[PDB]
Amino acid sequence: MTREEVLQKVAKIISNHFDIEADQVTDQLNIKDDLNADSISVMEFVLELEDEFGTEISDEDAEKIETVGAAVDYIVSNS
Secondary structure (H helix, E strand, O other): OOHHHHHHHHHHHHHHHOOOOOOOOOOOOOHHHHOOOOOHHHHHHHHHHHHHOOOOOOOOHHHOOOOHHHHHHHHHHHO
Protein backbone atom coordinates (compact mmCIF):
# COMPACT_ATOMS: atom_id res chain seq x y z
CA MET A 1 0.00 0.00 0.00
CA THR A 2 2.94 2.30 0.73
CA ARG A 3 5.67 3.49 -1.64
CA GLU A 4 7.96 0.79 -0.24
CA GLU A 5 5.66 -2.20 -0.71
CA VAL A 6 4.60 -0.89 -4.12
CA LEU A 7 8.13 -0.03 -5.28
CA GLN A 8 9.34 -3.47 -4.20
CA LYS A 9 6.50 -5.46 -5.77
CA VAL A 10 6.67 -3.53 -9.04
CA ALA A 11 10.45 -3.95 -9.10
CA LYS A 12 10.01 -7.67 -8.42
CA ILE A 13 7.16 -8.49 -10.80
CA ILE A 14 8.98 -6.43 -13.43
CA SER A 15 12.45 -7.83 -12.78
CA ASN A 16 10.81 -11.26 -12.87
CA HIS A 17 8.68 -10.88 -15.99
CA PHE A 18 11.44 -9.26 -18.04
CA ASP A 19 15.21 -9.77 -18.10
CA ILE A 20 15.89 -6.49 -16.30
CA GLU A 21 17.86 -6.19 -13.06
CA ALA A 22 15.75 -5.59 -9.95
CA ASP A 23 18.68 -3.48 -8.76
CA GLN A 24 19.30 -1.66 -12.04
CA VAL A 25 15.62 -0.77 -12.48
CA THR A 26 15.72 3.01 -12.10
CA ASP A 27 13.29 5.87 -12.73
CA GLN A 28 15.60 6.85 -15.59
CA LEU A 29 15.25 3.42 -17.21
CA ASN A 30 11.73 2.93 -18.56
CA ILE A 31 11.01 -0.79 -18.84
CA LYS A 32 8.51 -0.33 -21.67
CA ASP A 33 11.35 1.03 -23.81
CA ASP A 34 14.43 -0.51 -22.19
CA LEU A 35 12.89 -3.99 -22.26
CA ASN A 36 10.78 -3.04 -25.27
CA ALA A 37 7.81 -4.79 -23.66
CA ASP A 38 4.85 -5.27 -26.00
CA SER A 39 1.76 -3.05 -25.85
CA ILE A 40 -0.80 -5.71 -24.94
CA SER A 41 1.32 -6.68 -21.93
CA VAL A 42 0.74 -3.15 -20.64
CA MET A 43 -2.94 -3.99 -20.24
CA GLU A 44 -1.87 -6.75 -17.86
CA PHE A 45 0.80 -4.93 -15.86
CA VAL A 46 -1.48 -1.91 -15.46
CA LEU A 47 -4.11 -4.30 -14.10
CA GLU A 48 -2.08 -6.19 -11.50
CA LEU A 49 -0.76 -2.89 -10.14
CA GLU A 50 -4.29 -1.49 -10.03
CA ASP A 51 -5.51 -4.62 -8.25
CA GLU A 52 -2.70 -5.32 -5.79
CA PHE A 53 -2.27 -1.66 -4.82
CA GLY A 54 -5.97 -1.07 -5.41
CA THR A 55 -5.82 2.09 -7.51
CA GLU A 56 -7.53 3.28 -10.69
CA ILE A 57 -5.13 3.89 -13.58
CA SER A 58 -6.28 6.19 -16.38
CA ASP A 59 -6.16 4.95 -19.98
CA GLU A 60 -3.93 7.83 -21.09
CA ASP A 61 -1.49 8.16 -18.20
CA ALA A 62 -1.25 4.37 -18.32
CA GLU A 63 0.90 4.93 -21.40
CA LYS A 64 3.34 7.18 -19.53
CA ILE A 65 3.35 5.50 -16.12
CA GLU A 66 5.24 2.49 -17.48
CA THR A 67 8.60 3.21 -15.84
CA VAL A 68 10.08 2.32 -12.45
CA GLY A 69 9.54 5.87 -11.24
CA ALA A 70 6.58 6.76 -13.44
CA ALA A 71 4.86 3.80 -11.80
CA VAL A 72 5.48 4.20 -8.07
CA ASP A 73 5.17 7.97 -8.45
CA TYR A 74 1.66 7.33 -9.75
CA ILE A 75 0.46 4.56 -7.44
CA VAL A 76 1.84 6.41 -4.42
CA SER A 77 0.81 9.95 -5.35
CA ASN A 78 -2.60 8.45 -6.14
CA SER A 79 -2.78 6.31 -3.00
